[PDB]
Amino acid sequence: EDPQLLVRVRGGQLRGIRLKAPGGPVSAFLGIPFAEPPVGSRRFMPPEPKRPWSGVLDATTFQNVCYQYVDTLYPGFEGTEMWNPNRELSEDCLYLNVWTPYPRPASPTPVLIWIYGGGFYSGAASLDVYDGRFLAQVEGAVLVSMNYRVGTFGFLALPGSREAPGNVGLLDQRLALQWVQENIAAFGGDPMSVTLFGESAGAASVGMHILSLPSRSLFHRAVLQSGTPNGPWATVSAGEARRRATLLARLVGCNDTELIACLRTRPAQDLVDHEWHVLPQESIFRFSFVPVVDGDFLSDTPEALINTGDFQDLQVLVGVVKDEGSYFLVYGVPGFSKDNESLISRAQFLAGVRIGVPQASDLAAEAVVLHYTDWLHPEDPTHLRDAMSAVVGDHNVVCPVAQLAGRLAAQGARVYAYIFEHRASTLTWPLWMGVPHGYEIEFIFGLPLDPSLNYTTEERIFAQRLMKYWTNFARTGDPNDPRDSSPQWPPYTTAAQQYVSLNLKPLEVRRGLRAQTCAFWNRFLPKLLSAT
Amino acid sequence: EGREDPQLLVRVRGGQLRGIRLKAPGGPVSAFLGIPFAEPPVGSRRFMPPEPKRPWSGVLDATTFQNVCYQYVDTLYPGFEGTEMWNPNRELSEDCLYLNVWTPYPRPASPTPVLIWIYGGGFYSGAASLDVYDGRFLAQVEGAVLVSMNYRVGTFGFLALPGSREAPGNVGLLDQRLALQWVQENIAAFGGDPMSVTLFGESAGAASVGMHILSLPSRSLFHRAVLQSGTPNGPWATVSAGEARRRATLLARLVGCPNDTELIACLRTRPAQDLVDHEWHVLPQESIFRFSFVPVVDGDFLSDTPEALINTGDFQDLQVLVGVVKDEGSYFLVYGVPGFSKDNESLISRAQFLAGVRIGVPQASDLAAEAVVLHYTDWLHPEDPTHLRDAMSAVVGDHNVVCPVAQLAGRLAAQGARVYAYIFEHRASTLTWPLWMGVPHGYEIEFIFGLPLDPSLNYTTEERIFAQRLMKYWTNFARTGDPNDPRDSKSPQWPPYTTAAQQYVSLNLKPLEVRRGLRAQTCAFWNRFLPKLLSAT
Ligand SMILES: *[C@@H]1O[C@H](CO)[C@@H](O)[C@H](O)[C@H]1NC(C)=O
Ligand SMILES: [Cl-]
């Protein structure tokens, strides 16, 4: 009984496991319950804090993955399996994980709280890419990650009702954050220095905690990797939530109270069976059950809230990868496969755009097509294919990010922006996809530091750099190594618009994040649509 | 006859002419100046199509330039060469239908290719007698036969009551066409080859050349065409019949002329100067690069809109050279955009930019102007006054000239024309416009005509050599439909412009450089996108 692996938290005793990191041991406490299981009558309901337990709770293994859609489009393929659940699915899934340095840190250590992505329809804190051991060992970080409910279980709302108010998955996250405040000192964590980081939907969640007052007291700094609370996919209105919820109810044989009670009687997989049949049109980068502008968790729309908010005492790190949009094209755009090179033609490109910008009117779609065509090579298939990627990436990620970065900087935040440009040597997606959404995570988490994984030795040094930026940022609100002297990463501002490229070369400062094209998405396109 | 120069007496269909032996730098040239080609369009003939000049008796003296057609005279900048060089240099008079011929001296032994110049001036001004149109250098140096004509401008040339008998519209175009007919009939008397006639023109002259390409009865009158900084398509070169009716009756109101017959008859009783004095008061919006009386789409001279006709025309037989200057927009900014001046750097504010855009794109709805502003803003430095100044020039240039030219080049190419394309990029060392104006509209002309060949003009040596190069491109093109020198490959080649490759060349002091895409991204905005934002308003 190693006394380093024994911690008493507020609800009783836990026993972690000593894990091996390439350069030393780490203490890991996996599968800590932070809420009562949201099962039976508790489905769709806000999480309640977990009741006290007797004896020593075994926290040496990952708990169950929250009930979710599982991707079986390319069975056997590493590019997809790596995001699939690696534990039993269950509605009983509200658990978190803590990695700390071994021995337990001497003085209060900055805490990093990871929030996974998965479109609010999937994900798990237990995936290997979110392994907190490297960061804990190399940098002495206390690293926390939680499961939160996804899909219908986490985000089905009948806005206004009591039994399905929506945003409960965000409430799960908030509760794990509260848990950290109350308990992280026991692990040698500093509750007074909590940095949230997250990618894609995890990024939008982080943004939502930024924009929700009861969350603000639970962290001090935020990292948003390839996603934002603003933009076309992260939220829905009360009205559209209600509509999708009632349509799912209909699709499974089901007054709010009565409808919600009927929904509660359905096996989990039944809900997951019809999850993808409620979307208003054929689309990509669009998701059925996402946080809802409810006037409660989100007091107004993200756009409204970032325009008017005060961000004086907040540091934020935001960024994107070189090819935010490639991944998605294979999931429903005629002409795209991971298996060839997807050299499309013009007609496929125009049709691709009605799918990539599903809300787009004829005119809007046209404006997009005309903006993204290379008029010197109108019909070149390579350009058209790259363009389709760019449309999807820009509209959904890069431009929402530039907008977010801009508003936060204007309204008092310290902001650092990046573009991630290194394609992992081990990638199993084709070359034409470049650096797809999600492929920076393994680097930030420090996975190349594991000799067993066959990353190049340049990649291993790259990973060490990123871990340093992130944890420097967690420590100080500033990602720069203070010392050494590596040009400096300057803050993003609305005047200079400086951001850095993250790749094998040293930091390069660039100005303007797709500045002309995001002016198109962020300023012009809205005007075009608000004429029906 | 008896004692005078045997080389200077020529007969044409209307009678006998005496010309003048003129000095060019490299030796003498023949000039026949102020040959009448129509009955003076005066009195009851105002607004009416021209009639051929009745034959005369005796020897007509053709030794001096004749009257300039009645027109508005720019007085914004007294003594200023930048404006003066374009001003009428002969008496203003409605009696102005005259043309000019320059030939080698002595006259060519065998039929020589003919270049016909059509001057610009927005259809409200111009003159074939300006110093920049001096045909002597092209005649002396390239052995060209050069012809230029006066045609009626402003109301006299373009005021229309479409449908009517007495003011059918497009008569300035008809003046031009009559001079084309005169050349077919009479040019061989000067050693010119009626079977090898190239039209060249700049700005409204270019638009004019374009209308002739698009109008059947003009087709038989020439073989090849050069369009410099102007197209018949685009937002300023034509008006709808309805709009010309509007502008013409409004002008009539302004001068106290309150059916068509009775109105036109009243207009005919008005002094020419009254018409000119009210000419600018009829435009639907505050604007630049818009002129009150211009060619009308009459379903006659122009059987449909130039856009319609270029989109669906067969241009099998057509060789066309087309291009633009580097800064088509700069000139206009100082006329009617607040913030701009010839006398300072014109560093404007964002607000003066948004206002500028409303004036320069006067047909734009609010959404359209937003699009323009959105497209032309540099989002890294959106308040930078130098960028905004240059974007304002670019908006005006792109919208009125560069993109119309790209549109013209592409449509003509896609439909069988051999098209050569250029951007002229050298600023005259003698230019008196400020440096920020770059290479303004009109400032290639003096080069193509070979003025730098005149030692007294103060051009640099490089400019003298550059002019010779340009004169060679132009006259090779007139001779053969190809600007390239056949016996020469030490120099780089000028490829045809095609829809596939979109090649054009830079004209500056440096050897030819081939570039691809004529503002291809931006012109896709003006040519493909913007029309649709005017459809669904
Ligand atoms: C050019 O230079 C001469 C002599 O150097 C000067 O006196 C004259 O005024 C100038 N003439 C022109 C045409 O610019
Ligand atoms: Cl250019």
Give your account of this protein's structure:
2 copies of one chain form a homodimer. Chain A is α/β, with parallel strands linked by helices and 532 residues long. The first copy, chain A, has one domain: Alpha/Beta hydrolase fold, catalytic domain (Rossmann fold), CATH 3.40.50. In chain A, the strands form 4 sheets. In chain A, strands 3-4-8-10-9-11-12-15-16-17-18 form an 11-stranded mixed β-sheet, sandwiched between helices. In chain A, helix 13 runs antiparallel to helix 17. The first copy, chain A, is globular, with a radius of gyration of 22 Å. Chain A starts with 5 loop residues before the first strand and ends with a helix. At the A-B interface, helix 13 and helix 17 of A face helix 13 and helix 17 of B. The structure holds 2-acetamido-2-deoxy-beta-D-glucopyranose (NAG) and chloride ion (CL). Chloride ion binds next to loops of chain B. It is classed as hydrolase.
What's the topology here?
Two copies of one chain form a homodimer.
Chain A (H helix, E strand, L loop, with lengths): L5 E4 L2 E4 L1 E5 L2 E10 L22 E3 L6 E2 L11 H4 L7 E2 L4 E7 L7 E7 L17 H7 L2 E5 L4 H5 L12 H16 L5 E11 L1 H10 L2 H4 L4 E5 L10 E2 H14 L4 H8 L4 H7 L17 E2 L8 H7 L6 E7 L4 H4 L16 H11 L5 H11 L8 H30 L3 E7 L20 H5 L11 H20 L21 E5 L5 E4 L3 H15 L3
Parallel strand pairs in A: 2-5, 6-7, 9-10, 9-11, 11-12, 12-15, 13-14, 15-16, 16-17
Antiparallel strand pairs in A: 1-2, 3-4, 4-8, 8-10, 17-18
Helix pairs in contact in A: 12-13, 12-14, 13-17, 14-17
The complex binds 2-acetamido-2-deoxy-beta-D-glucopyranose and chloride ion.
